[PDB]
Amino acid sequence: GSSGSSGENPYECSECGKAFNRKDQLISHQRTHAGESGPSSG
């Protein structure tokens, strides 16, 4: 593994464990692991 390690994923999710090339990409993705709009009373 010359010139560092294979592949460069400076951004990786914690919920699923995905990896993106750009930050924004990961951010927009994280949205999937979020959905609190409706008034959850229970």
Ligand SMILES: [Zn+2]
């Ligand atoms: Zn994820």
